[PDB]
Amino acid sequence: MNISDVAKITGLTSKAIRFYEEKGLVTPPMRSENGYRTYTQQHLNELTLLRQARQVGFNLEESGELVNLFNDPQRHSADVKRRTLEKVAEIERHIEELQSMRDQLLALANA
Amino acid sequence: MNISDVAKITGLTSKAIRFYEEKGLVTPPMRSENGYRTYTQQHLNELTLLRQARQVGFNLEESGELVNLFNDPQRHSADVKRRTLEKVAEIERHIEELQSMRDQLLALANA
DNA sequence: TAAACCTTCCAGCAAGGGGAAGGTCA
DNA sequence: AAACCTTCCAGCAAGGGGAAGGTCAA
Helix, strand or coil: CCHHHHHHHHCCCHHHHHHHHHCCCCCCCEECCCCCEECCHHHHHHHHHHHHHHHCCCCHHHHHHHHHHHHCCCCCCHHHHHHHHHHHHHHHHHHHHHHHHHHHHHHHHCC | CCHHHHHHHHCCCHHHHHHHHHCCCCCCCEECCCCCEECCHHHHHHHHHHHHHHHCCCCHHHHHHHHHHHHCCCCCCHHHHHHHHHHHHHHHHHHHHHHHHHHHHHHHHCC
């Protein structure tokens, strides 16, 4: 699997994906003999995750942290769990805000 | 009300507030004799909304569109109502994405 | 008069996207 | 030839940081 298919599957551009690799936000792809980046399922998981994170308001740094959370060898550790619930609470503050907006728009529409 | 006060109420920084003004995304504030920007309730309304939209991942164009809905002179019109419910669906799609990510994270946490 | 405001202007990081020049695939 | 891929060199852009200086207030 080459980069354009990965871009389609993940919701990213090819350019964003090379940029994310450059920044060390994702695990690097293997390269075939012709120099082509080639990808595995774990690369899809990471990039899809990054794209979703960015799409709901996380900056690049935070979105990388999310990816690292699922990559962490110490998955079951208190630390990983702490950093996870912290992302959970932020997301929950966003949902509360979106629902506040939702109500306001519906009140506008129902005037 | 001066800009730093607006900042504390809306959750934006002063620099962001002037920038949104510069981009014409919010109604300009008045200026007192000393040149200070001064703000009204309308401004607090726009800027909070803009802070909320950006916080959950909408870009500047989309966020500005949310603000224009509530500003529109043809408020009670069929046209505005249709466009409002249209934005409600986008916000609901956004809520669902956040809940989905929340769900993945909680699954990681309960591992 | 010393802090805590305020103003504008210029700088840098940020998060990428465009497009060129050249190599590869089927 | 179409449609891929590579690196490189650039823009654009949503800001934040900070200089330089005016204003407001005991």
